């Protein structure tokens, strides 16, 4: 049933953007908060806050530069049905450097440019633009 | 469409039959016409058409259309078939190379001499 938390998080984010919701809440995890941090580094969202101890709840606030949503496209890449791994320099660059292809590497979670600067690679979580 | 389904049974390509199976990947075939006659055409082009049934060297008998106005073709004729189908004749998918050991070019024809066998006249 619940086969991928990351895909569910991306779907909830996209649905909140479509519905113009200000904040979206979900269960939290280390990978989820890492993805939230890597998104907030590039400022695709306002801020993420995780509350609670027995049931850790993460709530992310969506940015709105105008009526149009700040994030237009977001697509899961490394799905449980097919894992994706690229080389050191063969990571994809979405929209020729406009947007981030979130990648979890040996050191940790980072973006495509950070991975290229650090000279390593990993799995491509999702494209965001 | 599922990746697991594709892995368990790879997506295969559909075979496509050749429009001239009797040629067997050969540019031309030689045979002798078992019969030479005329066949009634389809609805719109009621113009009479000339055909011959010829049994090739491969043991298959095929019907081939005859081009030009006036044909130098008969039975017991060593002919040459090149391929090509006419949508106006039902069940006809072959063409005869007029000018191959038992046929002359179109009489009194001065155009498309290469395509109709005739050599270029001196004058």
């Amino acid at each position: 049933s619940m086969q991928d938390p990351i895909a569910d998080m991306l779907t909830r984010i996209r649905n909140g953007q479509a519905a113009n919701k200000a904040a979206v809440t979900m269960p939290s995890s280390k990978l989820k908060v890492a993805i939230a941090n890597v998104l907030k580094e590039e400022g695709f969202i306002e801020d993420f806050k995780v509350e609670g101890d027995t049931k850790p709840e993460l709530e992310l606030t969506l940015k709105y530069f105008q009526g149009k949503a700040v994030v237009e496209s977001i697509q899961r890449v490394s799905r449980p049905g097919l894992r994706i791994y690229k080389r050191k320099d063969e990571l994809p660059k979405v929209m020729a450097g406009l947007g981030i292809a979130v990648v979890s590497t040996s050191k940790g979670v980072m973006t495509d440019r950070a991975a290229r600067q650090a000279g390593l690679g990993g799995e491509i979580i999702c494209y965001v633009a | 469409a599922t990746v697991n389904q594709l892995v368990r049974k790879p997506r295969a390509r559909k075979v496509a039959k050749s429009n001239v199976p009797a040629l067997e990947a050969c540019p031309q075939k030689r045979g002798v016409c078992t019969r030479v006659y005329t066949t009634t055409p389809k609805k719109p082009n009621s113009a009479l058409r000339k055909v011959c049934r010829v049994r090739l060297t491969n043991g298959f008998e095929v019907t081939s259309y005859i081009g030009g106005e006036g044909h130098n073709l008969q039975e017991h004729s060593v002919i040459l078939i090149r391929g090509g189908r006419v949508k106006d004749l039902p069940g006809v998918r072959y063409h005869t190379v007029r000018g191959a050991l038992d046929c002359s070019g179109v009489k009194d024809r001065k155009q498309a001499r290469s395509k109709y066998g005739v050599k270029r006249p001196k004058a």
Binding site: - | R35, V36, Y37, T38, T40, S46, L48, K50, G70, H71, N72, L73, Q74, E75, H76, S77, D102, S104, K107
Partner: protein, 146 residues
């Protein structure tokens, strides 16, 4: 019976008689068997009492491997004097066009069963003519392209 299915489906035959025709040895000896091509014989006015036209000679293997026998050869209809001028007048101002229908035999003569058929009108091409006009207009209106 050589019913001439074209002249049967279109413009039913109305008048006919029995007469032979003149031919050489090349285009003969196969009409005795029956093979022929007499579908919609275009018999027109000839000074020699409307010489047989239209129908060709049978493609039977009687060829000298040069031609069948005669790609175009004279074929003569038979009438003493009854239908030269009358046939011209009928074709001119009646609409009846005489065509050959069948090849009956007295066991010796291949009889020209010519039938005087009515000239039937063409199908209404008033749609395809406009389609062709629109096609040529489309081909011509491609000027403003650079």
């Amino acid at each position: 019976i050589a019913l001439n299915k074209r002249a049967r489906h279109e413009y039913f035959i109305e008048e006919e008689f029995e007469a032979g025709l003149a031919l050489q040895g090349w285009e003969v000896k196969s009409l005795r068997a029956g093979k022929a091509n007499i579908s919609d014989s275009y018999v027109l006015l000839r000074d020699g009492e409307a010489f047989l036209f239209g129908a060709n000679i049978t493609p039977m293997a009687v060829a000298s491997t040069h031609v069948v026998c005669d790609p175009t050869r004279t074929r003569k209809l038979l009438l003493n004097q009854r239908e030269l001028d009358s046939l011209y007048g009928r074709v001119n101002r009646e609409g009846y066009t005489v065509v050959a229908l069948s090849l009956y035999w007295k066991n010796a003569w291949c009889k020209v069963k010519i039938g005087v058929a009515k000239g039937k009108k063409q199908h209404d091409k008033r749609s395809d003519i406009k389609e062709r006009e629109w096609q040529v207009d489309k081909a011509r209106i491609m000027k403003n392209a650079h």
